[PDB]
Design a protein around this motif. Structure first.
Motif, PDB file in Angstrom:
ATOM      1  N   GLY A 156     -65.384 -33.825  -7.613  1.00 30.77           N
ATOM      2  CA  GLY A 156     -65.790 -33.553  -8.983  1.00 30.77           C
ATOM      3  C   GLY A 156     -65.194 -32.335  -9.669  1.00 30.77           C
ATOM      4  N   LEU A 157     -64.222 -31.690  -9.034  1.00 25.43           N
ATOM      5  CA  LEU A 157     -63.568 -30.526  -9.631  1.00 25.43           C
ATOM      6  C   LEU A 157     -62.164 -30.966 -10.031  1.00 25.43           C
ATOM      7  N   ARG A 283     -69.408 -24.365 -11.493  1.00 27.84           N
ATOM      8  CA  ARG A 283     -69.040 -25.776 -11.590  1.00 27.84           C
ATOM      9  C   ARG A 283     -69.207 -26.417 -10.209  1.00 27.84           C
ATOM     10  N   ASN A 286     -72.607 -27.104  -9.261  1.00 34.77           N
ATOM     11  CA  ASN A 286     -73.224 -28.123 -10.099  1.00 34.77           C
ATOM     12  C   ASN A 286     -72.873 -29.533  -9.627  1.00 34.77           C
ATOM     13  N   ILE A 287     -72.267 -29.624  -8.447  1.00 37.36           N
ATOM     14  CA  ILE A 287     -71.863 -30.905  -7.871  1.00 37.36           C
ATOM     15  C   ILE A 287     -73.026 -31.696  -7.269  1.00 37.36           C
TER      16      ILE A 287
END
Ligand code: HEM
Ligand SMILES: C[As](C)(=O)[O-]
Ligand SMILES: [Ca+2]
Ligand SMILES: [Ca+2]
Length: 306
Positions: A156-157, A283, A286-287
């Motif tokens: 997700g990054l 970020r 926030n996964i």
């Protein structure tokens, strides 16, 4: 929906208890701050930051601690147990291990001289560990830049800034000779050292990691400031002094058109790096988090509630 104020009513002193626990541990183990950051990364890259990495073996599932990336690498679990016990004493069944590890990582960075900020909170704990996923999702030091990007994108990054900024976690901490022997004596079966490794630094590393020497010997990721969280990691990269292949690739890979400018900017400004690190850390934190009534508030990080 994670919020920095999540525990301001239920456990207002959680961050202080965590910081206190780390400061005490640092008195005897100066490497603990780096170890804790690594644990948070390893947690978030496998099913998200759900403290799945803290679970020990059970007859139904294997622990992620046995992952190629964690086995004989990850450490500091006893320290996490201590701070969890302290928080449980202060505010029973309130703070999740997932959040606890997140705060610990941020506090560790700040304690090592890095930026200070309040991390979003509200994460809950998983009901199982994911060893296979860990082996598949965690990046390896021998990964090429495209593989590193794929690794990050997979969880997700998507941003190159995520990769370059978070790789800055290597501004402190240790690495084993094991992971650089190829760069020092036989890179990619070429029979030669990695050409992207500064030749003067190559000699130094060879002295620390001789052929047929102890592969478990520890080496500093940052030759400039080994235990201080700063932007020196990037200055090293500009000089071809990144320790592991994955570090140097950010600056020297043929696919580094988008990463080189970031490396230079972070090496150029401490403020620029710190802002991007905070940005990227949140970020990553926030996964795929479990929230609300999903998952549980694990009382013992090592096992699911019974
Ligand atoms: C980009 C891909 C990455 C790779 C290939 C990678 C690889 C490694 C390796 C091989 C070690 C050495 C483990 C050992 O010798 O036992 C390690 C340690 C460490 N990594 Fe990374 N890492 C990556 C990303 C990250 C990220 C995203 C963070 C945190 C934001 C991080 C923080 C750390 C820290 C602090 C240590 C030192 C731990 C200690 O000294 O106990 N790493 N990493
Ligand atoms: C899960 As995300 C890094 O897109 O906020
Ligand atoms: Ca996890
Ligand atoms: Ca440093």
């Amino acid at each position: 929906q994670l919020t920095p104020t999540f525990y301001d009513n239920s456990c207002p002193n959680v961050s202080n208890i965590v910081r206190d626990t780390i400061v005490n541990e640092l008195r005897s183990d100066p490497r603990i701050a780096a170890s804790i950051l690594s644990l948070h990364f390893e947690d978030c890259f496998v099913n998200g930051c759900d403290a799945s990495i803290l679970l020990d073996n059970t007859t139904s599932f294997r622990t992620e601690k046995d992952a190629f990336g964690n086995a004989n690498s990850a450490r500091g679990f006893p320290v996490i147990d201590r701070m969890k016990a302290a928080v449980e004493s202060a505010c029973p069944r309130t703070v999740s291990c997932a959040d606890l590890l997140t705060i610990a990582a941020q506090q560790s960075v700040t304690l090592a001289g890095g930026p200070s900020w309040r991390v979003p909170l509200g994460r809950r704990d998983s009901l199982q560990a994911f060893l296979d996923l860990a082996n598949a999702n965690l990046p390896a030091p021998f990964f090429t830049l495209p593989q590193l990007k794929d690794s990050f994108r997979n969880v997700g990054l998507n941003r190159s800034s995520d990769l370059v900024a978070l790789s800055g976690g290597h501004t402190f901490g240790k690495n084993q000779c094991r992971f650089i022997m190829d760069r020092l004596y036989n890179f990619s079966n070429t029979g030669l050292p990695d050409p992207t490794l500064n030749t003067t630094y190559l000699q130094t590393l060879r002295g620390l990691c001789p052929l047929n020497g102890n592969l478990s010997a520890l080496v500093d990721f940052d030759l400039r400031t080994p235990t201080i969280f700063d932007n020196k990691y990037y200055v090293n990269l500009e000089e071809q002094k990144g320790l592991i292949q994955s570090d140097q690739e950010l600056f020297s890979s043929p696919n580094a058109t988008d990463t080189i400018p970031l490396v230079r900017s972070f090496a150029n400004s401490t403020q620029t790096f710190f802002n991007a690190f905070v940005e990227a850390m949140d970020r990553m934190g926030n996964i795929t988090p479990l929230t609300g009534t999903q998952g549980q508030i694990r009382l013992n990080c090592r096992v699911v509630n019974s």
